[PDB]
Symmetry: C2
Subunit: 230 residues, 2 copies
């Protein structure tokens, strides 16, 4: 241990999209003197949306004050957006955190917690329209900073997000060393990572596959928004 150790905490909830957590985890855990916490109601196993089992290391109650709080996205976001225990924890940690952050649909949770009002932010492309009712000003960029808020786009944007955050916590040379250790020189075999470049038939397939979830999440978002409006 060190008096100056940086405390980084990820919310780990059932039906998280695990890459939203595990991509950033590997970038940030590599940084000098960092301790990374995986936070839920109690320590123990938590099942991600793929069926991969992750393990929370601390409860909300025992989590130390965080220098960075990060909300990963996933199917489980809808429940979180109306989880008073989780939202209260997020607001409490955000009061003093150096950085308040999210990846993918985790920004919808920051929105439900009241932390995006009047702020520019992004989220997963398929849910991007849900930012505005939460008070955010939506921006279509992969990593969006507004003061001490940092939000990443959909799933794999967590890697770009975390390297950006690494340079802010330390410096460019440190982020570059991590990027090289991860051999992060991506060369995607297709050009379908954005709805603006993917084949139109693939975009339609993706939207159809997401329509039921988007409908349910919109209902949740509007209830969360009405709470903020009152």
């Amino acid at each position: 241990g060190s008096h100056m150790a940086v405390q980084i905490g990820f919310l780990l909830f059932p039906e998280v999209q695990q890459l939203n957590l595990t991509g950033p985890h590997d970038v940030l855990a590599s940084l000098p003197d960092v301790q990374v916490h995986l936070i839920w109601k109690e320590p123990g196993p938590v099942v991600a949306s793929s069926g991969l089992v992750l393990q929370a290391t601390t409860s909300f109650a025992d989590c130390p004050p965080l220098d960075v709080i990060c909300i990963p996205g996933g199917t489980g976001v809808g429940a979180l957006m109306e989880d008073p225990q989780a939202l209260a924890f997020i607001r409490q940690q955000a009061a003093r955190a150096r950085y308040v952050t999210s990846v993918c649909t985790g920004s919808l949770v920051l929105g439900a917690a009241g932390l995006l009002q009047g702020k520019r932010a992004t989220t997963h492309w398929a849910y991007h329209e849900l930012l505005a009712p939460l008070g955010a000003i939506p921006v279509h960029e992969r990593v969006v900073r507004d003061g001490n808020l940092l939000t990443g786009g959909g799933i794999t944007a967590g890697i770009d997000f975390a390297l950006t955050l690494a340079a802010e916590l330390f410096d460019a040379a440190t982020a570059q060393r991590v990027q090289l250790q991860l051999e992060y020189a991506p060369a995607p075999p297709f050009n379908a990572g954005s709805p603006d470049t993917a084949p139109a038939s693939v975009v339609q397939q993706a939207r159809q596959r997401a329509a039921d979830s988007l409908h349910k999440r919109r209902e949740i978002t509007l209830r969360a928004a009405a709470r903020l409006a009152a």
Copy 2:
């Protein structure tokens, strides 16, 4: 129990580099009609090199016959390269698997198992010189295919590897749909992901940080290579 599901297995071992497993796992588990296994000597918790805890779903003995075997890399591969039980599992699965695969330094395990003799393969850039003593034809590319062998480069190459494998298992349109769902249109904040583009100062800092591991792994590699004589 979808009977025609592709059976995909990752070796999950102590001191795995978790992102070598969790990146490809999230890609492949998104495919239709697949079942993904995490295999170790027994089911239960397995701690990755960063301290992230993962959970093996099956023992070697209980694992079904796999269509795809995938060996992730990590600090723990040195032990695997001389682990007779793990090597026997790999060899028996590879004897009939439709695809034999690895990410990062997992190809050194395939090499120790005798499965790269005369075969084109890659690995993490910092360990690439360990391929030739194991009989491989070392190839400086991010994803290398040689018959039913498919190997990926260091850590984050797992995502590009897995999308390539997804198109082989299914088709391009299916792999594109997963790419879009993962929003995998990378925009790295630095250009240091390869030793060819990173600043030379950064390459030196990465090489020095890897030096003790490389020393240990070279000794193991030369013992494993001599055992390939018969």
